[PDB]
Design an enzyme around this catalytic site. Structure first.
Site, PDB file in Angstrom:
ATOM      1  N   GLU A  25       0.713  -1.109   0.041  1.00  0.00           N
ATOM      2  CA  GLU A  25      -0.147   0.022   0.015  1.00  0.00           C
ATOM      3  C   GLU A  25       0.696   1.249  -0.025  1.00  0.00           C
ATOM      4  O   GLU A  25       0.500   2.083  -0.585  1.00  0.00           O
ATOM      5  CB  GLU A  25      -0.999   0.087   1.089  1.00  0.00           C
ATOM      6  CG  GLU A  25      -2.053  -1.044   1.243  1.00  0.00           C
ATOM      7  CD  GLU A  25      -3.132  -0.916   0.213  1.00  0.00           C
ATOM      8  OE1 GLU A  25      -2.840   0.250  -0.653  1.00  0.00           O
ATOM      9  OE2 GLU A  25      -4.170  -1.514   0.174  1.00  0.00           O
ATOM     10  N   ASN A  36      -7.753   8.653  -5.215  1.00  0.00           N
ATOM     11  CA  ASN A  36      -8.703   7.564  -5.802  1.00  0.00           C
ATOM     12  C   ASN A  36      -9.479   8.289  -6.831  1.00  0.00           C
ATOM     13  O   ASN A  36      -9.736   9.258  -6.881  1.00  0.00           O
ATOM     14  CB  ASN A  36      -9.693   6.956  -4.648  1.00  0.00           C
ATOM     15  CG  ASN A  36      -8.798   6.219  -3.690  1.00  0.00           C
ATOM     16  OD1 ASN A  36      -7.931   5.637  -3.947  1.00  0.00           O
ATOM     17  ND2 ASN A  36      -9.176   6.527  -2.582  1.00  0.00           N
ATOM     18  N   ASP A  54     -12.577   8.335  -7.201  1.00  0.00           N
ATOM     19  CA  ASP A  54     -13.698   9.196  -6.720  1.00  0.00           C
ATOM     20  C   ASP A  54     -13.446  10.207  -6.277  1.00  0.00           C
ATOM     21  O   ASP A  54     -14.186  10.892  -5.551  1.00  0.00           O
ATOM     22  CB  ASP A  54     -14.459   8.202  -5.938  1.00  0.00           C
ATOM     23  CG  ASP A  54     -13.754   7.868  -4.596  1.00  0.00           C
ATOM     24  OD1 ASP A  54     -12.737   8.193  -4.197  1.00  0.00           O
ATOM     25  OD2 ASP A  54     -14.627   7.617  -3.567  1.00  0.00           O
ATOM     26  N   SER A  64     -11.554  10.364  -3.337  1.00  0.00           N
ATOM     27  CA  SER A  64     -11.164  10.332  -2.007  1.00  0.00           C
ATOM     28  C   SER A  64      -9.673  10.106  -2.131  1.00  0.00           C
ATOM     29  O   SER A  64      -8.998   9.807  -3.168  1.00  0.00           O
ATOM     30  CB  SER A  64     -11.809   9.397  -1.313  1.00  0.00           C
ATOM     31  OG  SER A  64     -11.397   8.019  -2.136  1.00  0.00           O
ATOM     32  N   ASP A  70      -6.352   8.193  -0.283  1.00  0.00           N
ATOM     33  CA  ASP A  70      -5.742   7.148   0.770  1.00  0.00           C
ATOM     34  C   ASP A  70      -4.587   7.693   1.441  1.00  0.00           C
ATOM     35  O   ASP A  70      -3.684   8.201   0.903  1.00  0.00           O
ATOM     36  CB  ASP A  70      -5.413   5.963  -0.053  1.00  0.00           C
ATOM     37  CG  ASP A  70      -6.549   5.549  -1.129  1.00  0.00           C
ATOM     38  OD1 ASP A  70      -7.439   5.273  -0.783  1.00  0.00           O
ATOM     39  OD2 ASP A  70      -5.984   5.373  -2.220  1.00  0.00           O
ATOM     40  N   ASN A 107      -8.639   4.946   3.427  1.00  0.00           N
ATOM     41  CA  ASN A 107      -9.334   6.032   2.478  1.00  0.00           C
ATOM     42  C   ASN A 107     -10.209   6.915   3.129  1.00  0.00           C
ATOM     43  O   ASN A 107     -10.737   6.625   4.189  1.00  0.00           O
ATOM     44  CB  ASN A 107      -9.753   5.532   1.177  1.00  0.00           C
ATOM     45  CG  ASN A 107     -11.223   4.775   1.616  1.00  0.00           C
ATOM     46  OD1 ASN A 107     -12.188   5.549   1.905  1.00  0.00           O
ATOM     47  ND2 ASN A 107     -11.638   3.525   1.446  1.00  0.00           N
TER      48      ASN A 107
END
Ligand SMILES: CC(=O)N[C@@H]1[C@@H](O)[C@H](O[C@@H]2O[C@H](CO)[C@@H](O)[C@H](O)[C@H]2NC(C)=O)[C@@H](CO)O[C@@H]1O
Ligand SMILES: [Cl-]
Ligand SMILES: [Cl-]
Ligand SMILES: [Cl-]
Ligand SMILES: [Cl-]
Ligand SMILES: [Cl-]
Ligand code: NA
Ligand code: NA
Length: 129
Positions: free
Chosen positions: A35, A46, A48, A50, A52, A59
């Site tokens: 990650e 991301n 959308d 958002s 992380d 997120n």
């Protein structure tokens, strides 16, 4: 902070992640590796909108508040910036909530795609724990 592998393993162990919800420690280290490359300051956006955050790329759509993810939740009840701390407590405590939410570690895409079903114990190999 960029953790060493075993440093992170030990930190995660101290914070109770080893076998937390049945997920041996190597799962968490593997997840963190892929990650964030063990970097507490990692952020990624991301599709959308958002973001992380942190070593486990938690997120803002669901888990933290960053003030710029409209319509999102903050289920860990933390500013997302807390997940960037060199102190992984906030990330771990949030990850405990996430992994407890019914989907286990599949919440971590990198874990699902790169750790799940692999020899995750390799990730804590050689570590003093
Ligand atoms: C526990 C956690 O926060 N995991 C992150 C995933 O949530 C990220 O996946 C992305 O999450 C956003 C917000 O829910 C989704 O809109 C987006 O579709 C999803 N992306 C993918 C490829 O599934 C993930 C992004 O790399 O990072 C952590 O695993
Ligand atoms: Cl490494
Ligand atoms: Cl393990
Ligand atoms: Cl927001
Ligand atoms: Cl820590
Ligand atoms: Cl599970
Ligand atoms: Na990710
Ligand atoms: Na949020």
């Amino acid at each position: 902070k960029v953790f060493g592998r075993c440093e992170l393993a030990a930190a995660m162990k101290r914070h109770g992640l080893d076998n937390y919800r049945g997920y041996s420690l190597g799962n968490w280290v593997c997840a963190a590796k892929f990650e964030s490359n063990f970097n507490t300051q990692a952020t990624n956006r991301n599709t959308d909108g958002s973001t992380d955050y942190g070593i486990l790329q938690i997120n803002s759509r669901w888990w933290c508040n960053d003030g710029r993810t409209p319509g999102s939740r903050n289920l860990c009840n933390i500013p997302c910036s807390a997940l960037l701390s060199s102190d992984i407590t906030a990330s771990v405590n949030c990850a405990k909530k996430i992994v407890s939410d019914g989907n286990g570690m599949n919440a971590w895409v990198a874990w699902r795609n790169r750790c799940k079903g692999t020899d995750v114990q390799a990730w804590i190999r050689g570590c003093r724990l």
